[PDB]
């Protein structure tokens, strides 16, 4: 335990920027792909919404991480908004 799960909705209409300011690493463990937050721009929108390095992305737009692919993801993050299910440590 120690980990908490919460939903995040981020919208591009808040910033002059067209990007959210974070990076993800993708890795396959025992046939299943997991997504982790690699870095978060301190001044970016993702940081503003509480995303942190080391967080795990469980879902994007209600789709499990292992069921996403790259073209699907590039599409979702170029849209005006996107929803995330994130597993994180408090603080």
């Amino acid at each position: 335990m120690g980990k908490v799960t919460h939903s995040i909705h981020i919208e591009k209409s808040d910033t002059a920027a067209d990007t959210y300011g974070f990076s993800l690493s993708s890795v396959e463990e025992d046939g299943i792909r997991r997504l982790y937050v690699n870095s978060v721009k301190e001044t970016g929108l993702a940081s503003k919404k509480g995303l942190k390095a080391g967080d795990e992305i469980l879902e994007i737009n209600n789709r499990a991480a292992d069921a996403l692919n790259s073209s699907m993801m590039e599409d979702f993050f170029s849209q005006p908004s996107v929803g995330l299910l994130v597993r994180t440590y408090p603080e």
Partner: peptide, 7 residues
């Protein structure tokens, strides 16, 4: 199959 994405 370690990929990385920037968003």
């Amino acid at each position: 199959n370690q990929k990385e994405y920037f968003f």
